[PDB]
Symmetry: C2
Subunit: 339 residues, 2 copies
Amino acid sequence: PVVNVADAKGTNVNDKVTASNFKLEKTTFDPNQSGNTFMAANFTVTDKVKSGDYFTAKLPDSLTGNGDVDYSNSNNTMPIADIKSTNGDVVAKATYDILTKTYTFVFTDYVNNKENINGQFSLPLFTDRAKAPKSGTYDANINIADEMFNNKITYNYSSPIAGIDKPNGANISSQIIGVDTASGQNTYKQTVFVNPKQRVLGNTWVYIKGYQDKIEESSGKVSATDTKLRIFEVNDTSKLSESYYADPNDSNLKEVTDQFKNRIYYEHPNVASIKFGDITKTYVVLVEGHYDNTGKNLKTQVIQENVDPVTNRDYSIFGWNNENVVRYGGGSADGDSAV
Amino acid sequence: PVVNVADAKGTNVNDKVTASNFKLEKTTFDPNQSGNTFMAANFTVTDKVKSGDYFTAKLPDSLTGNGDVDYSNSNNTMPIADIKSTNGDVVAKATYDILTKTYTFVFTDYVNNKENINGQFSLPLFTDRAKAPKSGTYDANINIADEMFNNKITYNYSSPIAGIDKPNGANISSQIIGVDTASGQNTYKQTVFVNPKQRVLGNTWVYIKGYQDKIEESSGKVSATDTKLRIFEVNDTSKLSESYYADPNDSNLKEVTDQFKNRIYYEHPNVASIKFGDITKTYVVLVEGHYDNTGKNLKTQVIQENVDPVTNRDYSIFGWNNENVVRYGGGSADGDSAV
Ligand SMILES: [Mg+2]
Ligand SMILES: [Mg+2]
Ligand SMILES: [Mg+2]
Ligand SMILES: [Mg+2]
């Protein structure tokens, strides 16, 4: 069904581009607390190039260019600030391919009959919650125009394992690891860890709220129509990530969603209630919800409540907050050509 | 020397654009603690327009589109995310004029033979530290395509008047109210309030550091060549702004910079030392410095130290931190046309 694709286009000119003066803002941070970094580099075009010629930058397993901003509803492509000339003309158009973690800078006409083309650029960088699942240090070697710039980044993820300091106190945690702020659909992906302490909890209930204290302060929309939940039993809690990334097809997870057919209730506005009952294992709840158009930050709160299995007393409750900005500067407009 | 200018261009088409569904993220915040807001609106083109036609948005006295990001070294013009089509083509180019607090959206060719052009856009909004000097509520009425959208914003500026809780304890405050992250010059504007408590301080010294604890953690560059200081005596401290905006030509300020010819020392790396001596009035120090290219956040720390005028004892010292991000995604490149 056709032939080669290797982005042939106006041909790759990484062989005519030299990156230098590579800098990283910081090499240690906590992605669970808005922690992220930045990169900057200089680049000079060593030979004559044309409009349509392009050079690239590739990210290693440990990094992503989009972070918690989901672009799956945008062809899995992330728009990037272009490199501009003093006049303001675009010297090159920038785009980030989520799948190949590759940045593509395509030169415009400005490059036609020009020499000594020299400049610089900086880009935001984040953790790859899926490939850097645990806290620790990773190689973060970056490739710019077929040149390597070695780095080492340390991720100190705030631990997902948290709760009341009591032998069998309530304990739950969460993190919104995906927010679509560009497509217009306004979706978000959130991972919830119920009982990551692996304690024995009686008559436990979990609440996933689309707000924290004031419903009007959050854009979150949690309802039977706006929210989709999938529940999994964790076999080995220590194999559970600290970045909250959780693949529904993970072998360490046993999906028990069906068993919860009638254990999920939408009793109160913007609140999904889950009846877990007596449990001893850790559970993962994969949330796929939406937020409104008020532009308010997406604020969520997960609560876990329970009593002692044996005495049905010794009540305990624990809560965890989440908050992601939904802001997406710019605008969108579309019209139809006249008949 | 010529004629009219009123941005004639491809003519103003505000008369063919209707804004609606106006929303403000929040109406109350603290600009001294990263407090700012956002606006969003829908817009439809009511008549046929061409490439080059443009509509505008005007901000009231209480707001600015740039905030603490200085654009004076960029023709006092602020680049703004364009309005894109599904295809990704630019429906309109956006630009913000700092001077006239006006946003100009210029339609491209995409608009030529099109109808039902409909869309939306959102923009960051900040306080006008100069026109909303004091904490309180102001009218924040915004004009979009010759249509008004009334608002009321309340600014709770963290008070500049702070220091040791002692009849004559050290007391100082500051705020970086201007950072140039686009031109390449890397300048910053910081206002310092020395003794805003109007206490009587003996043998007082003030230190303006371009870092906080670790010199390597900040991009700040404070030195005889990188820093320029102007010192003013405050006549009525209550007339002093809470947003830290301080015009050197303000009537409430008496410049005593010359008198400090030999009272300013650069003894320690990244630290400017000022010998005030015995003082009772409040002083304003206008700082014009630079930061390096490490991309590190601009972190500063101002310290005030003193003893009791009468006993030359009862030592006191107070410090104040500042921190602004220097990050400016994107890139710059320039070449020369070949001979
Ligand atoms: Mg190369
Ligand atoms: Mg257990
Ligand atoms: Mg109009
Ligand atoms: Mg006094």
